[PDB]
Design a protein around this ligand. Structure first.
Ligand SMILES: Nc1cc(O)c(C(=O)O)cc1/N=N/c1ccc(S(=O)(=O)Nc2ccccn2)cc1
Length: 127
């Protein structure tokens, strides 16, 4: 098996804007999750060669990871905070799709997802 190229993280032609939500998504949400004890499997694209997962990209057609999300936020790749929230949810659900209920890695994603939901609950929407 061979990996796909990572998701795009930079497009010089896309319009750029900074919002309080995007700022919070990067400075608080991504930062908090990145430092979580369970973060390390999700900090870069799944390397199915290095991890000996030859069917991963046969099953996962929309890969996503927090290293990509970090780059997207940093490059002003997102226009809407919802695009970022969706990438986080793609990352969590990818793990659920590839693995099985009760798997350790699925419990780890579930814990990260709970933390994620607690943090976006406090998203600044002009407070
Ligand atoms: N499954 C994985 C698949 C992967 O692809 C990668 C990766 O690519 O990096 C890492 C993975 N890691 N898998 C772990 C499984 C258990 C533990 S654990 O020692 O903390 N034990 C428990 C037990 C129950 C609940 C929580 N943790 C740590 C990591």
């Amino acid at each position: 098996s061979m990996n796909p190229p990572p998701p795009e993280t930079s497009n010089p032609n896309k319009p750029k804007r900074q919002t309080n939500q995007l700022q919070y998504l990067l400075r608080v949400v991504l930062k908090t999750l990145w430092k979580h004890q369970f973060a390390w499997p999700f900090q870069q694209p799944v390397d199915a060669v290095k991890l000996n997962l030859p069917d991963y990209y046969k099953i996962i057609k929309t890969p996503m990871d927090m290293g990509t999300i970090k780059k997207r936020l940093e490059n002003n790749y997102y226009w809407n905070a919802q695009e970022c929230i969706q990438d986080f949810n793609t990352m969590f659900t990818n793990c659920y799709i590839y693995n099985k209920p009760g798997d350790d890695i699925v419990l780890m994603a579930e814990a990260l997802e709970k933390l994620f939901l607690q943090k976006i609950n406090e998203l600044p929407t002009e407070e």
